[PDB]
Amino acid sequence: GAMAPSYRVKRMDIAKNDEECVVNAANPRGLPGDGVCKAVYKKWPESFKNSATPVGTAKTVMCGTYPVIHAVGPNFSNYTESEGDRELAAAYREVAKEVTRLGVNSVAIPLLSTGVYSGGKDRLTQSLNHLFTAMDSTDADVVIYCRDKEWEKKISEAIQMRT
């Protein structure tokens, strides 16, 4: 575990993370995809061997000795608000189980279902709160990656609000 388990946020490409493993915002089919998923495919393409997994789950595949945890959030274009919320919570719970199993001291994680799976809504608070519900009981250092300056400020404020 980390000596003083923490949450942090950085505004940069998660493919350039400084953590012991990465969470991919995957599609269920293990396809290269776009956004975070395409960056992850370019950096760790070996991790997409048999990475297909259903919505609400996470599947880890090693790239060398570096673990890539493929976490499949719901596409809110297809799910109801109610069912989508349940599957988004479940995907983060499966990430917490994998991070624990791997014995890593740190993990890089994007906000699931906030980009092309958002169904055109702002889901920063929804997705971040499900991330906290899952990861709070883990002792890995968690580093959240985002691309937008306003999102960085809101995620940083939400972390600091608990501290």
Q: Where along the sequence are the contacts to Cl ion (CB under 5 A)?
A: 12-13, 115, 117, 146-148, 151
Least distance (Å) between residue 148 CB and Cl ion: 4
Closer to Cl ion at the Cβ: 36 or 100?
A: 36
Q: What angle do CA 56, 59, 64 make, to 5 degrees?
A: 155
Least distance (Å) between residue 121 CB and Cl ion: 11
Question: H or E element: which one contains 39?
Answer: helix 36-43
Least distance (Å) between residue 103 CB and Cl ion: 28
Least distance (Å) between residue 4 CB and Cl ion: 27
Q: Are 123 and 114 in contact (CB under 8 A)?
A: yes
Q: What Rg, from alpha-carbon coordinates, does the chain have? A: 14
Count Cβ atoms within 10 A of the Cβ of residue 70 and give its class: 0-12 exposed, 13-18 middle, 19 or more buried.
buried
Instruction: Tell me how far apart the alpha carbons of residues 80 and 98 are, in angstroms, rounded to a whole number.
Output: 27
Least distance (Å) between residue 42 CB and Cl ion: 13
The answer to whether the annotation marks 115 as part of a ligand binding site is yes
The β-bridge partners of 61 are 68
Work out whether strand 7-11 and strand 22-25 pair parallel, antiparallel, or are unpaired: unpaired
Identify the sign of the CA torsion 31, 148, 161, 141: positive
The answer to whether the annotation marks 92 as part of a ligand binding site is no
Closer to Cl ion at the Cβ: 48 or 145?
A: 145
Closer to Cl ion at the Cβ: 28 or 115?
A: 115
Instruction: Tell me how far apart the alpha carbons of residues 71 and 66 are, in angstroms, rounded to a whole number.
Output: 16
Closer to Cl ion at the Cβ: 77 or 80?
A: 77
Closer to Cl ion at the Cβ: 81 or 148?
A: 148
The answer to whether the annotation marks 116 as part of a ligand binding site is yes
The answer to whether the annotation marks 35 as part of a ligand binding site is yes
Q: Which residues are annotated as a binding site?
A: 13, 27, 35, 115-117
Q: Which residues are annotated as a binding site for ADP-D-ribose?
A: 13, 27, 35, 115-117
